[PDB]
Design a protein around this ligand. Structure first.
Ligand SMILES: [Mn+2]
Lengths: 106, 101, 105, 87, 103, 79, 109, 99
DNA sequence: ATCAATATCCACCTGCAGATACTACCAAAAGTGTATTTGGAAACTGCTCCATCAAAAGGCATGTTCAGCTGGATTCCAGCTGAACATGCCTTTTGATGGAGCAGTTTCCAAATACACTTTTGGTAGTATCTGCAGGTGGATATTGAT
DNA sequence: ATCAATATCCACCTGCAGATACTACCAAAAGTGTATTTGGAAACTGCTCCATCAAAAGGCATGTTCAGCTGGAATCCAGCTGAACATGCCTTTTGATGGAGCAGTTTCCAAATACACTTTTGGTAGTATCTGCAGGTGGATATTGAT
């Protein structure tokens, strides 16, 4: 049996393990860590997916693309901060216009 | 007629992603373009974590990264409520690992 | 009789601007023209170092990443006139935005 | 059979509308006259900046081509990590 | 009742003079206790009843201030940019946004 | 008073180092209310190292790394 | 011991310590013996380069011993270093004499 | 006496050594020294880590001197690099010639 | 141009918070041949991709004319703010200890790990059918603007 | 409020490239099992160092009074910056062929790891004068701001 199901996950605790030895951040690699890791990564993916999903729906579409993704990401407080210096190809911006730039009094 | 000098295996999570995709939205699809952000989502974060962890080792002259470091790493890196969940989510599967076989 | 200006339809100064902000904000395609930007990526390299090659892709980032830049800097700038109490962006605004960001001195 | 013609002053290959467009996307309504030029140079500084890097990659791997990865390595390393193109 | 025309350094001068005075000085510009009071008031909310190393608090009083000191230069600019000279808190808010603070 | 225990003249004193001529009345609170975030964020990152090495004292090393990873790196304490 | 590697290069920077220092952080599996020198050299020069302009800043304000303020003035008054430490704070360093334009007495001249 | 003897090894001494080869008659406060150790330290990692980064991109494992050059090329601004890039390509060929 | 009223900046004065230099000391940081390990350049060399011309064509940039309205300099002006200047509370301090608690230690099994088998699998080629969305035509309602 | 004139919602369809969907191979990677080898919990106590208390002082702060004028606020007015209009060029689009110069398989060696045993010196830990400076003393007159 596999270590994924073994920890009840979808991410590869095998493949992330490799990328911790070959990676060189330390010599000795723990045994809980690579699990904790996969898990960690998996939450995020998920978090953001469940986000640009509703986005995807908002504009009545069913195939999440970058735009919805950047709508997810940006339209949300905690994520934004995680990717404050990050960038997303065909990103699109969040629609928005400053106020004094709107016309009034005839 | 194919396989013309074996190209160094380019390996992504496009499966692992899409696995966890269907869980969130059963009927809701995904671009290459749309995915091809997602893989860097992982890509980006992993290294940010492996990194910050590696740093902690040498702050305590430790040679190994425990899932305790990862927590601290995540606890530092991942902000607000995103950290909380993760912390627990991390442990949850960790525990499923520690109490097996 | 001689009192009614002219006949052709014209929109007020800035009402196409609003019309457009609304637009180039709604979508996402890269905003300068491929091959003209292209050369500017070719020519700046060739000036660092000659006999060189750009991957079909690799100019793309340089562009994608490069708009992005400004559009986001532009935002910082749009904000700066507004702050000075204005609707118009004159260099200084940028220069100021560059300044604070820590881009110059 | 080669080409490689003279390559000078392309910055204006960044043209008023296209500049102006980013000014829309930016949420900008009224554009000064000096802008477009001022703008053209910042792009260069930019470009100028990221490409030293992406080449110093190519340059280094003993490469003669600016592979997608390079540019990205060079973007992230500057503060502007980009998702999409590779790595 | 009076004094027969007193010496009053017409306002603004003492300011410019203090700038001259304070810019070339290097030592910190906040009382250590109130700081160490505040350095201990907040910190608790992450781990309870702690101790601060001799240097630790000051390393902050370096940074904390160092952050502010600069944060002001930036504010002034904005004020000046709006053709002003007095730093209205709107400036600060604007000067936060830009660095990547409120945005 | 703690945060209010941060003096309006000290606010002025540090501002003068930035070359502030004229200080509006509101600034004094805002300064405190911009100094707070700074600290919360700084110390948060700091203590998190403490809590790793198993310590009840915020070391100096605890901080350097906080300010480094914060991006506001500091010089002359790491000893 | 006979003679030093740092002397085999003519420095005051421990080519020995470097080669071990470049293991503790775990920067790679293998190290080319050229690097620990190449590094030391650069670091060495760099340290000097400041000291120079810092020691240069000493006479100007009639004092002999270098204080932080002199190290800060050394750093910021240069271009190529100001940038190199555009994201760094020296403890107790203070700030360079800079008063903005509009602020001076009798309007703006 | 070897109990609390856990060393805090620093560049400080080497820095004073250098403090002399251009300004041989100069004092430096122990707090102004504390800075200079935070300097080279910073400069050490920065370059090292970059040369450490410069490995895997190329599927590398041995940090050769080259990737240090490049690290510093990538690291150090304008004119100020040129010298350093030189300074280090120097010493390398000296120790090549040396024992 | 006059000159009271301060703040400032020069050598000259001396004491202490602070750097300078020596002696005692010992685990470790460093250097040296050795015997063995493998990364990595170096050539043949397939194969993918980029530089390149082709020609069609067409959307999008240019530049010029004409105005509507936003900037700039206008004086202004009322209350917000620096200055002084009176206290006077409230940091500063050093002085020198209760006492943690971080440092330090020598243990000692769980945890990491490198070695040789084992078994799946996820990734690419290649092959071949579906299917979401850009995109064009076209028919009601929206917003803007001249009335 | 109504008329008029452009841009846009809103659903409608093609049509094809962009996803997703099989086989089939198939190389590495992932997992199982024991063996080795070790980094760090786990208590015990030292000792540098962190926490208020002590006990006079007044330095730095605040609440204070008055104007000195800077923010903001209108008023006007020249002219830039937008909307539009007429063109056309150079951008864009689609294949097509050399041919680079990149990538992977196959080889053999310069250089480096992993041991093992002796050698030099940087941090530690004091005891003592060394020493430039960091804050008072006159004395001077520029920088300020009344006349
Ligand atoms: Mn050129």
């Amino acid at each position: 049996k596999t270590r994924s199901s073994r920890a009840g996950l979808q991410f590869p605790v095998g493949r992330v393990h490799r990328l911790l030895r070959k990676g060189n951040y330390a010599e000795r690699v723990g045994a809980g860590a690579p699990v904790y890791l996969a898990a960690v990564l998996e939450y995020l993916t998920a978090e953001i997916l469940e986000l640009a999903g509703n986005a995807a729906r908002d504009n009545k579409k069913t195939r999440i693309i970058p735009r919805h993704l950047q709508l997810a990401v940006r339209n949300d407080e905690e994520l934004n901060k995680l990717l404050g210096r990050v960038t997303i190809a065909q990103g699109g911006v969040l629609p928005n216009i400053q106020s004094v730039l709107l016309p009034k009094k005839t | 007629d194919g396989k013309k000098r074996r190209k160094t295996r380019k390996e992504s999570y496009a499966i692992y992603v899409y696995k966890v995709l269907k869980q969130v939205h059963p009927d809701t699809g995904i671009s290459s373009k749309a995915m091809s952000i997602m893989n860097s989502f992982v890509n980006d974060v992993f290294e940010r974590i492996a990194g910050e962890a590696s740093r902690l080792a040498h702050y305590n002259k430790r040679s190994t990264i425990t899932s305790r470091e990862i927590q601290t790493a995540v606890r530092l890196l991942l902000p607000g409520e995103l950290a909380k969940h993760a912390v627990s989510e991390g442990t949850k599967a960790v525990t499923k690992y520690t109490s097996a076989k | 009789a001689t009192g009614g200006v002219k006949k052709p339809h014209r929109y007020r100064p800035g009402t196409v601007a609003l019309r457009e902000i609304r637009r180039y904000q709604k979508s996402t395609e890269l905003l300068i023209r491929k091959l003209p930007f292209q050369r500017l990526v070719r020519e700046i390299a060739q000036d660092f170092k000659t006999d060189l090659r750009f991957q079909s892709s690799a100019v793309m980032a340089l562009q994608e990443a490069s708009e992005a830049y400004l559009v986001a800097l532009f935002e910082d700038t749009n904000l700066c006139a507004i702050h000075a109490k204005r609707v118009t962006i004159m260099p200084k605004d940028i220069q100021l935005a560059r300044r604070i960001r820590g881009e110059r001195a | 059979k080669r080409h490689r013609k003279v390559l000078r002053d392309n910055i204006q290959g960044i043209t008023k509308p296209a500049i102006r467009r980013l000014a829309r996307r930016g949420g900008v309504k009224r554009i000064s006259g000096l802008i477009y030029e001022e703008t053209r140079g910042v792009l260069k500084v930019f470009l100028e900046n990221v490409i030293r890097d992406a080449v110093t990659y190519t340059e280094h791997a003993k490469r003669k081509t600016v592979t997608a990865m390079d540019v990205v390595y060079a973007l992230k390393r500057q503060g502007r990590t980009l998702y999409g193109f590779g790595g």
